[PDB]
Design an enzyme around this catalytic site. Structure first.
Site, PDB file in Angstrom:
ATOM      1  N   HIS B  41       0.999  -1.264   0.115  1.00  0.00           N
ATOM      2  CA  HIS B  41      -0.077   0.082   0.151  1.00  0.00           C
ATOM      3  C   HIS B  41       0.805   1.066   0.052  1.00  0.00           C
ATOM      4  O   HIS B  41       0.327   2.369  -0.030  1.00  0.00           O
ATOM      5  CB  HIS B  41      -1.093   0.012   1.080  1.00  0.00           C
ATOM      6  CG  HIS B  41      -0.511   0.375   2.521  1.00  0.00           C
ATOM      7  ND1 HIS B  41      -0.129  -0.648   3.413  1.00  0.00           N
ATOM      8  CD2 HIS B  41       0.315   1.574   2.915  1.00  0.00           C
ATOM      9  CE1 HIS B  41       0.434  -0.332   4.582  1.00  0.00           C
ATOM     10  NE2 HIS B  41       0.618   0.844   4.252  1.00  0.00           N
ATOM     11  N   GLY B 138       3.428   5.821  10.004  1.00  0.00           N
ATOM     12  CA  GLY B 138       4.793   5.677   9.576  1.00  0.00           C
ATOM     13  C   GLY B 138       5.590   4.514   9.763  1.00  0.00           C
ATOM     14  O   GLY B 138       6.717   4.107   9.630  1.00  0.00           O
ATOM     15  N   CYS B 140       4.514   1.387   9.285  1.00  0.00           N
ATOM     16  CA  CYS B 140       4.357   0.275   8.478  1.00  0.00           C
ATOM     17  C   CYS B 140       5.466   0.034   7.643  1.00  0.00           C
ATOM     18  O   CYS B 140       6.590   0.789   7.695  1.00  0.00           O
ATOM     19  CB  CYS B 140       3.324   0.736   7.386  1.00  0.00           C
ATOM     20  SG  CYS B 140       1.632   0.818   7.856  1.00  0.00           S
TER      21      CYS B 140
HETATM   22  C1  LIG Z   1       1.426   2.655   7.917  1.00  0.00           C
HETATM   23  O1  LIG Z   1       2.410   3.391   8.520  1.00  0.00           O
HETATM   24  C2  LIG Z   1       0.108   2.743   8.820  1.00  0.00           C
HETATM   25  C3  LIG Z   1       0.318   2.426  10.191  1.00  0.00           C
HETATM   26  C4  LIG Z   1      -1.133   2.724  11.298  1.00  0.00           C
HETATM   27  C5  LIG Z   1      -1.236   4.048  11.298  1.00  0.00           C
HETATM   28  C6  LIG Z   1      -1.821   4.168  12.683  1.00  0.00           C
HETATM   29  N1  LIG Z   1      -1.334   2.870  13.420  1.00  0.00           N
HETATM   30  C7  LIG Z   1      -1.000   1.895  12.642  1.00  0.00           C
HETATM   31  O2  LIG Z   1      -0.561   0.814  12.823  1.00  0.00           O
HETATM   32  N2  LIG Z   1      -0.883   2.257   8.175  1.00  0.00           N
HETATM   33  C8  LIG Z   1      -1.817   2.936   7.796  1.00  0.00           C
HETATM   34  O3  LIG Z   1      -1.995   3.886   7.973  1.00  0.00           O
HETATM   35  C9  LIG Z   1      -3.171   1.992   6.985  1.00  0.00           C
HETATM   36  C10 LIG Z   1      -2.595   2.358   5.651  1.00  0.00           C
HETATM   37  C11 LIG Z   1      -4.126   2.132   4.566  1.00  0.00           C
HETATM   38  C12 LIG Z   1      -3.644   0.426   4.758  1.00  0.00           C
HETATM   39  C13 LIG Z   1      -4.747  -0.306   3.959  1.00  0.00           C
HETATM   40  C14 LIG Z   1      -4.498   0.038   2.205  1.00  0.00           C
HETATM   41  C15 LIG Z   1      -4.572   1.706   2.200  1.00  0.00           C
HETATM   42  C16 LIG Z   1      -3.523   2.289   3.204  1.00  0.00           C
HETATM   43  N3  LIG Z   1      -4.354   2.490   7.432  1.00  0.00           N
HETATM   44  C17 LIG Z   1      -4.786   2.095   8.608  1.00  0.00           C
HETATM   45  O4  LIG Z   1      -4.319   1.316   9.449  1.00  0.00           O
HETATM   46  C18 LIG Z   1      -6.197   2.316   9.008  1.00  0.00           C
HETATM   47  N4  LIG Z   1      -6.797   1.326   9.394  1.00  0.00           N
HETATM   48  C19 LIG Z   1      -8.014   1.109   8.427  1.00  0.00           C
HETATM   49  O5  LIG Z   1      -8.389   1.649   7.492  1.00  0.00           O
HETATM   50  O6  LIG Z   1      -8.725  -0.461   8.697  1.00  0.00           O
HETATM   51  C20 LIG Z   1      -9.710  -0.864   7.864  1.00  0.00           C
HETATM   52  C21 LIG Z   1     -10.967   0.055   8.232  1.00  0.00           C
HETATM   53  C22 LIG Z   1     -11.551   1.117   7.508  1.00  0.00           C
HETATM   54  C23 LIG Z   1     -12.743   1.680   8.099  1.00  0.00           C
HETATM   55  C24 LIG Z   1     -13.053   1.419   9.201  1.00  0.00           C
HETATM   56  C25 LIG Z   1     -12.957   0.506  10.098  1.00  0.00           C
HETATM   57  C26 LIG Z   1     -11.503  -0.430   9.493  1.00  0.00           C
HETATM   58  C27 LIG Z   1      -6.132   3.328  10.355  1.00  0.00           C
HETATM   59  C28 LIG Z   1      -5.390   4.284  10.099  1.00  0.00           C
HETATM   60  O7  LIG Z   1      -7.517   3.704  10.455  1.00  0.00           O
HETATM   61  C29 LIG Z   1      -8.046   3.724  11.701  1.00  0.00           C
HETATM   62  C30 LIG Z   1      -7.229   3.806  13.002  1.00  0.00           C
HETATM   63  C31 LIG Z   1      -9.072   4.810  11.629  1.00  0.00           C
HETATM   64  C32 LIG Z   1      -8.606   2.161  11.990  1.00  0.00           C
END
Ligand SMILES: *[C@H](O)[C@H](C[C@@H]1CCNC1=O)NC(=O)[C@H](CC1CCCCC1)NC(=O)[C@@H](NC(=O)OCc1ccccc1)[C@@H](C)OC(C)(C)C
Ligand SMILES: *[C@H](O)[C@H](C[C@@H]1CCNC1=O)NC(=O)[C@H](CC1CCCCC1)NC(=O)[C@@H](NC(=O)OCc1ccccc1)[C@@H](C)OC(C)(C)C
EC number: 3.4.19.12
Lengths: 301, 301
Positions: B41, B138, B140
């Protein structure tokens, strides 16, 4: 989010660990530049260490750095640490300082046997100057440390275990933390207390991470808080502690003394089947700095 | 003695972390030989990653290894990991394996931001295939790992956080643990359970360390134990678990099913103001191997 008992990356320290053998004793040493630091009780035969050391020759000290035997060209004793001058400077020597920490401060311990790292964990210096470590025979000379940007600040070297299963040691200049001495005569830790300012820091970590159930509307005076703290064997909270807790108070909008009101009720009522940050106990081995570091992502080059 | 949540020494992994930048996204990558592994991603613009990746050029990927910019000469996608072929082999590449672990297994996480290690902590794969990590934006590409003698077995790479504050990710071949997908659509962890065999391991750690207050005279059948376990949301204990707990049973002289009797009473009565190994909760993130490793001092070359 999430909140873990997090240790510093250990690699800079791993690059310094060596095996020190003298007589029938093997323990760890810390190789920085051309000196190997290790506990002085590595030496032979109510010990008088000046007498024992004068009877030693350099070739009595076997120093193994991986598969390389290091030659000791001199030695000296500084307090309870031995310093072995070797003919090779450690090329992996990080930027480092030696620091004598205050009780309540935390550090990472790189547990080592035969110069080889076994594990890393986070520890606090207890108010009674012990640490609740995880140490077996052969772990002497394992060090505790903090990292700031790129500098390794060594604060602990392991010497001994006390009958309650806690641990005592020195700073890297060989001065014991607490009243302990490096002789196998009867010694005991002393009654410990809970590190109040750290509990408050961890309650702020909890709020930063979405746990708010323990908060309340009340406030308390520092005086009135400390009167409850003493009843529960907590360290007095000082105005300096309050000031240190400033950044966390400002980030969460919860005045320090308001958090003190929460802690007081937590002390008086328990947590009643609930947990904070995955704990059913009030956790006191995170400093305010630890909380801010982990909750904002500080790294180390 | 003593018993700590202990992570593996992280240095071998620290030597592999790099910054991967593509577009407006920065995360961590894992540099082993001439390949940099990172979450897919990281790429630009309900995503269709095959379409997104075909639209990319190598020069879209900025890979920073310290103060050295690494040149991407190719790329491929394997499941949910991107693999960036670079023109330089990492000279710090440890001996390593990629392993897909089972729920209940533990590992150390080297939390990283911008390719720079921030901290290390121990984690378990939960029964619901999340991990209770400590991760910010950050992080990830931070990896989880175990070490066996000299080999780093990578088992986890961080991708995302779920709404309960727990974390989901993949093995190093890019297969998610659990049902999760790398798209920002609604997903939830699933109800978790307690890792029974690990709780038993930690009760043996407690005995090895002098805590015996929770033992009893009783025994229990595996069947009868599992009937109580299910009531308290514990994983079923299998005969394999019993067999794995053999060495710890043999070292302590406490038959596995006798420890199961103790756990059953602990579940039924709580701990009643007492602690085990400094915990007021039954701890389930130590495997039988973890306990034996820490209580006997295994190291890593
Ligand atoms: C990478 O560095 C980050 C690490 C995250 C940031 C905060 N804590 C972490 O461990 N990863 C992300 O920010 C990812 C990025 C996306 C991953 C999927 C593909 C597109 C990029 N996003 C998340 O980790 C979000 N989670 C999420 O969307 O889960 C599915 C979902 C969507 C909607 C409702 C419920 C569940 C996080 C950042 O969003 C929330 C914290 C709001 C859940
Ligand atoms: C160095 O590798 C070991 C590490 C110990 C071993 C078990 N856990 C550890 O952390 N250090 C020792 O074995 C030292 C060695 C002596 C230190 C002083 C100078 C002479 C060498 N010994 C101890 O750590 C012992 N503690 C001790 O003697 O404390 C004082 C005392 C004496 C008598 C009664 C009460 C207190 C340990 C090994 O002994 C006990 C575990 C029985 C306390």
């Amino acid at each position: 989010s999430g909140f873990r008992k997090m240790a510093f990356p250990s690699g800079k320290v791993e690059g310094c660990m060596v095996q020190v053998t003298c007589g029938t004793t093997t323990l760890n040493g810390l190789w920085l530049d051309d000196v190997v630091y290790c506990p002085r009780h590595v030496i032979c035969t109510n010990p008088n260490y000046e007498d024992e050391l004068i009877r030693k020759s350099n070739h009595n000290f076997l120093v193994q750095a991986g598969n390389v035997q290091l030659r000791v060209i001199g030695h000296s004793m500084q307090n309870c640490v031995l310093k072995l001058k070797v003919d090779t400077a450690n090329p992996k020597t990080p930027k480092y300082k030696f620091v004598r920490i205050q009780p309540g401060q935390t550090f990472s311990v790189l547990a080592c046997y035969n110069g080889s790292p076994s594990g890393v964990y986070q520890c606090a210096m207890r108010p009674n100057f012990t640490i609740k470590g995880s140490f077996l025979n052969g772990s002497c000379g394992s060090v505790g440390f903090n990292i700031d940007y790129d500098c390794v600040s060594f604060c602990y070297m392991h010497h001994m275990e006390l009958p309650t299963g806690v641990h005592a040691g020195t700073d890297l200049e060989g001065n014991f933390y607490g009243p302990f001495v490096d002789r196998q005569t009867a010694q005991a830790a002393g009654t410990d207390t809970t590190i109040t300012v750290n509990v408050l820091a961890w309650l702020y970590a909890a709020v930063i991470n979405g746990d708010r159930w323990f908060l309340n509307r009340f406030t308390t005076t520092l005086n009135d808080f400390n009167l409850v703290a003493m009843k529960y064997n907590y360290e007095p909270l000082t105005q300096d502690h309050v000031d240190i807790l400033g950044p966390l108070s400002a980030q969460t909008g919860i005045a320090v003394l308001d958090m003190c009101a929460s802690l007081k009720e937590l002390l008086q009522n328990g947590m009643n089947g609930r947990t904070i940050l995955g704990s059913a106990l009030l956790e006191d081995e995170f400093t305010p700095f630890d909380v801010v570091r982990q909750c904002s992502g500080v790294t180390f080059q």
